[PDB]
């Protein structure tokens, strides 16, 4: 049923690592605050798909 929980962690770390790669500083906890997710386990497939939308826009646009 759910395999995106870890995918989300990879994509937030990609965001964080890319953000650090660009410049300044980036932390996963502040990245999680973008998604405003209290717990990674407690996240509905619908919300996590919405989360991906937030991240892809931050990471994919600067990649493409």
């Amino acid at each position: 049923s759910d395999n995106d929980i870890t995918e989300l962690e990879e994509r937030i770390n990609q965001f964080v690592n890319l953000s650090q790669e660009k410049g300044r500083d980036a932390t996963i906890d502040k990245t999680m605050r973008w998604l405003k997710i209290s717990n990674i386990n407690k996240l509905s497939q619908k919300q996590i798909a919405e989360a991906h939308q937030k991240l892809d826009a931050g990471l994919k646009q600067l990649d493409s």
């Binding site: 953000s19 660009k22 410049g23 980036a26 931050g58």
Partner: protein, 217 residues
């Protein structure tokens, strides 16, 4: 009121540092005062400059009896659209959000030498955002009722180029502060994860400029 120290130095080719050494005045203060940026001037400074440049204060202070005053609506007609997406990639106010509408009237009094003064109302609405830099975007407002301001253009270009530029700078700052105050309150801060900037700080830094036939510069 227009300090011509800057112009005078361009005329004589005199470097700002050279003048500061000769007149025993701080370079920083002299350069700040060169473009008449500082709103305070020391009598000692002007005395020393006049004696040093062999000029009367007339060539230093250029004043046109005409006066311009600008009053912004207490409540403007503004609508906001917040994308909240793409601000993270690099400082960019446009990706974070944009102002759907921001139409408001500015009451401008062009005071003649005669005590009588002329009141002209200009309505400026959000036109677009100027991408001056990827980091900073300056909101653009266009005057809708330029017909009421036909005489406004005549008064504006009736002043010296330096004075025109001065006016443009003042109105630009005032507009920028006005729009920033209005927007920052309706905009939640977005941290720039990609040295540390909050979308609030972006709003503060982002300015706005009136693009119109009445004020082309």
């Amino acid at each position: 009121i227009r300090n011509r120290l800057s112009e005078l130095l361009s005329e004589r080719g005199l470097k700002i540092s050279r003048v500061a050494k000769d007149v025993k005045i701080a370079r920083s203060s002299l350069t700040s005062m060169a473009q008449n940026d500082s709103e305070m001037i020391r009598y000692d400074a002007i005395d020393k400059l006049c004696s040093y440049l062999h000029i009367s204060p007339s060539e230093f202070f250029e004043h046109n009896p005409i006066n311009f005053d600008f009053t912004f609506d207490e409540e403007p007609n503004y609508k906001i659209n917040d994308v909240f997406e793409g601000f993270e990639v690099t400082a960019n106010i446009t990706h974070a959000f944009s102002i759907e509408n921001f139409d408001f009237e500015i009451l401008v009094d062009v005071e003649l030498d005669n005590r009588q003064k002329l009141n002209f109302d200009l309505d400026v609405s959000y036109k677009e955002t100027e991408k001056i830099t990827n980091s900073q975007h300056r909101f653009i407002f266009t005057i809708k009722n330029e017909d009421e301001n036909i005489g406004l253009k005549k008064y504006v270009d009736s002043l010296s180029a330096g004075l025109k530029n001065l006016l443009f700078k003042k109105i630009n700052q005032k507009l920028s502060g006005y729009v920033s105050e209005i927007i920052v309150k309706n905009i939640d801060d977005i941290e720039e994860l990609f040295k540390s900037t909050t979308l609030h700080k972006e709003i503060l830094q982002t300015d706005s400029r009136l693009s119109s036939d009445i004020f082309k510069e």
